[PDB]
């Protein structure tokens, strides 16, 4: 009996460690004897440790995660794809946590519950990746969402943070209701919620004239929920406001991990299921809309956070082009894009968090940065050029695939849109470089140097961004492996 639970050792450990940290934090934060010490950094270090131990347990036990698969079948499904997705999710969570300590001590954000909520949301996203039934998928999505709602409003006396939370909760709850409605329609039409059963029922028919309008609209509503989650246009406008109004570590965490989890869900639901061309057309139109709107709105922005939010919207458009084309290379390119975008976003938010120690808000606040911190201005410039997709930086992969699929699926309007939006993006990315290097403002802002954690993370992500294309084989092989494991 005990050995059956080897399939959930990683999750058991992280949940138990989260409980231990909750108890530790609440017991000593309330201690008069110790004079109510702030425990955000102490619990943060212990939680980073817990995340790393979870990663060790998961990575080193790859076969064991598939033990007792028949017993666990109606609860979840673990395979190679989920293996790599969960490893990447844990790595992203560890990096995001490591970027938070200067924020904890200098702002004096003393709430250790922040770390606990991050860990519980990580548990939720882990269960999201392995979900193999509509019920499990919904429950894990809701756990993740509720944790985000709470942490988005963590600055509870701030107008901005409270506004972010309110908008997030209302729009999140609305989208979740729409998705749940879709799930109910699919169950009513097919008598099934398990992904295997849905695959068997729906395969071979798609729209064979006598199409289940119940099945067709259930798929549509579920897709609407998914598109809200990935911040695809027209279900996107929550994202810029929430990203800007939330505390910056929250914004960094939301920018990466939920995308990984929800894209795992989307792959395993749609790609593994079957209504077909309708849904790929959904993602096609949403990709085009996201690219165009992201480019234009980002061009309008004068503030750093909003610029990065709109940039992420545009990039999810680029990524969803891969899902749309419906090929093994499409899935592989989507995964490569997710990985590279995540690393670049981690780099960008490490810089943003470093600059938040002097309250960076506007793009113009970067003036004369090439004088006051030359190596920081260069590092940030490499990130921008990578965001623009200039070769040989890592960001060039997403552009290359966008056009590869445009000429592979046979889509020339898509190629035209890609060209135009890429040029617009390059303009608003090099505007930052111009501000740091070319401008001569009358008043300068002198920034405090970053802590060791962010400097090390920045140093590694900056080598990856510059040098990835010299040795890109491991990512290519692992992503091809994952794309194949979805069906075999």
């Amino acid at each position: 009996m005990f050995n059956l639970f080897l399939a959930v050792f990683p999750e058991i450990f992280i949940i138990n460690a989260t409980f231990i940290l909750l108890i530790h934090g609440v017991v000593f934060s309330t201690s008069k004897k110790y004079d109510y010490p702030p425990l955000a950094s102490n619990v943060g270090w212990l939680g980073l440790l817990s995340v790393l131990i979870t990663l060790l347990l998961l990575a080193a036990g790859a076969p064991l995660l598939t033990i007792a698969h028949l017993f666990w079948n109606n609860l979840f499904r673990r395979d190679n794809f989920t293996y790599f997705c969960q490893i990447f999710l844990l790595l992203s969570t560890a990096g995001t946590i490591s970027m938070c300590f200067d924020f904890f001590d200098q702002e004096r954000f003393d709430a250790f519950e922040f770390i606990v909520l991050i860990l519980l949301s990580t548990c939720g996203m882990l269960f999201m990746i392995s979900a193999y039934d509509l019920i499990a998928m919904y429950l894990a999505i809701e756990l993740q969402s509720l944790c985000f709602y709470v942490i988005a409003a963590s600055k509870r006396k701030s107008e901005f943070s409270t506004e972010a939370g309110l908008k997030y909760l209302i729009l999140g709850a609305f989208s979740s209701g729409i998705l749940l409605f879709g799930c109910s329609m699919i169950y009513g039409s097919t008598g099934a919620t398990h992904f295997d059963q849905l695959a068997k029922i729906l395969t071979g028919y798609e729209i064979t004239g006598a199409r289940s309008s119940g099945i067709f609209m259930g798929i549509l509503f579920i897709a609407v929920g998914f598109l809200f989650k990935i911040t695809a246009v027209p279900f996107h406008m929550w994202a810029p406001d929430i990203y800007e109004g939330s505390p910056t570590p929250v914004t960094a965490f939301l920018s990466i991990a939920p995308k990984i989890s929800i894209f795992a869900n989307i792959l395993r639901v749609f790609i593994y299921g079957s209504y077909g061309a309708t849904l790929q057309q959904i993602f096609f139109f949403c990709s085009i809309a996201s690219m165009i709107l992201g480019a234009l709105a980002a061009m309008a922005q004068t503030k750093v956070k909003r610029l990065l939010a709109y940039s992420s919207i545009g990039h999810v458009g680029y990524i969803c082009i891969g899902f749309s084309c419906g090929t093994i290379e499409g899935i592989q390119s989507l995964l490569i894009g997710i990985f590279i975008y995540a690393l670049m976003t981690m780099d960008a938010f490490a810089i943003v968090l470093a600059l938040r120690q002097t309250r960076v808000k506007y793009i113009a606040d970067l003036g004369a940065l090439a004088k006051t911190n030359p190596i920081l201005a260069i590092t940030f410039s490499i990130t921008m050029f990578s965001y623009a997709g200039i070769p040989p930086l890592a960001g060039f992969c997403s552009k290359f695939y966008l056009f590869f699929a445009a000429l592979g699926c046979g889509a020339y309007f898509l190629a035209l849109v890609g060209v135009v939006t890429s040029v617009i993006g390059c303009f608003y990315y090099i505007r930052l470089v111009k501000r740091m290097f070319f401008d001569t403002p009358r008043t300068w802002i002198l920034y405090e140097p970053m802590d060791r954690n962010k400097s090390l993370l920045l140093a590694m992500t900056s080598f990856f961004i510059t040098l990835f294309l010299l040795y890109p084989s491991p990512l290519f092989s692992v992503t091809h492996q994952m794309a194949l494991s979805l069906y075999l």
Partner: protein, 94 residues
């Protein structure tokens, strides 16, 4: 069978009529306190706990040890939450 609910409806109708008769015969001759929200939240949580207890209580003879320990784990999570509330002063009305 749902047959036994019909007398309840007729009982409700009669009780309502008695209420109207009794009440109608004499016509012939800005300070928000968060602790209420908090007690509402606690009641909601333990209301759901009782809700989940009901099927478990009637099903103990069939679920045996596995069901017992799964409910115990459920209770462990909820009781950790309760300990958190207790330490934070949510249960103190002074």
């Amino acid at each position: 069978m749902m047959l036994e609910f019909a007398p309840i409806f007729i009982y409700l109708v009669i009780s309502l009529l008695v209420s109207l008769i009794l009440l109608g015969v004499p016509f012939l001759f800005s300070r928000f306190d968060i602790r209420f929200y908090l007690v509402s939240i606690l009641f909601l949580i333990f209301d759901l706990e009782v809700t989940f207890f009901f099927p478990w209580a009637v099903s103990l003879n069939k679920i045996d040890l596995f069901g017992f320990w799964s409910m115990m784990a459920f209770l462990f999570i909820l009781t950790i939450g309760f300990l958190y509330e207790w330490k934070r002063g949510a249960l103190d009305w002074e």
